[PDB]
Chain A
C-alpha cells in the first residue's frame, strides 16, 4: 500500500 506507507 502506497498510502499506508505514507499513513505510517
Chain B
C-alpha cells in the first residue's frame, strides 16, 4: 500500500508551544502560547502538505491557498486525535507543554469552542477510529475548503480530492455505515473551525487591548485569508448538507 506508507512516513512529530507552566493561567499568556504553537505547527503543516501524494499536481498558488484556508481544521483534527490517544479525551492536548484542563478552558475565554473540540476528540473513541482512518481523513481535510469562485487550476484539485476520497473508502474496505460516519465526523470539524476562525479574528483585532501576541505569519494569515472564509468567499466542502 504505497499510499498509507507515505501518509505514515510524513506524519509530523511532537511540537511544543514553549508555554511557561509555572506562571498563573491568564488569558493573555495562554492565548499568546496557543498563537506561538499555531505558528510552529504551520511550519510543520506546510512541509507535510507539500510531501503528500499528488500535491504538486496543484498550481503553486493553489498549494499555498489550500494550506492557508485549511490549517485550522487540520490542526484541530490532529489535536483531537492527540487528546484521544494521550489523555483519553479528558483534556485538550494542544502540546506536551500545553494541556488544557477545564480551568484553562475557562480562562482561555474559548470554553464553548474547547468543549466542542473535546466532543470531537471523544468521537475518535466512540467511533473506534483507527490510526490509518485518522491519517486518511486528516489528508482529506487539506482538500476540504476552497474559494466559492474556484481555484486557479481547479481541475487538478477536483481530481486530487476524488483520489483522497477513494483512498479512504478503500481503507474502509454496512461498511457504507462506516463511510457515512467518517464523512459526518469530517463535516463536524468545519463548524468548530469556523468558530475558532471568528474567535481568532476578533482576538487579532483586539490584540493590543488584551496584550495577546500574534506571530508574523499568524497575523498575516488571519488578516488576509481568514476573513475570506468568514465573509463567505471561501467555504468548506461538506459531504452532507
Which of A1, A3, A4 is B42 in contact with, Cβ under 8 Å? A3
B48-94 interface with A by 8 A CB criterion: 63-64, 67-68
Chain A residues within 8 Å of B219, by CB? 2
Take A7-B64, A7-B67 as given contacts and tell me if A2 and B46 are in contact as well, using a CB distance cutoff of 8 Å: no
**Do A2 and B42 touch across chains, with their CB atoms under 8 A apart?**
no
**Do A3 and B43 touch across chains, with their CB atoms under 8 A apart?**
no
Q: How far is the CB of B165 from chain A (nearest CB, A)?
A: 26
Which of B63, B67, B217 is A2 in contact with, Cβ under 8 Å? B217
**Do A6 and B220 touch across chains, with their CB atoms under 8 A apart?**
no
A-B contact number at CB 8 A: 22
Chain B residues within 8 Å of A2, by CB? 216-217, 219-221
B71 to chain A: closest residue by CB: A3
1/0 contact trace for B82-109 toward A, CB 8 Å? 0000000000000000000000000000
Chain B residues within 8 Å of A6, by CB? 42-43, 46, 217
Complex alpha-carbon distance, A1 and B68, angstroms: 12
Q: How far is the CB of B44 from chain A (nearest CB, A)?
A: 11
A5 to chain B: closest residue by CB: B217
B50 to chain A: closest residue by CB: A7
Chain B residues within 8 Å of A1, by CB? 220
Chain A residues within 8 Å of B217, by CB? 2-3, 6
| Complex A-B: 18 CB contacts under 8 Å | A1-B220, A2-B216, A2-B217, A2-B219, A2-B220, A3-B42, A3-B64, A3-B67, A3-B217, A3-B221, A4-B64, A6-B42, A6-B43, A6-B217, A7-B46, A7-B63, A7-B64, A7-B67
* Residues in A lying within 8 Å of B, measured CB to CB: 1-4, 6-7
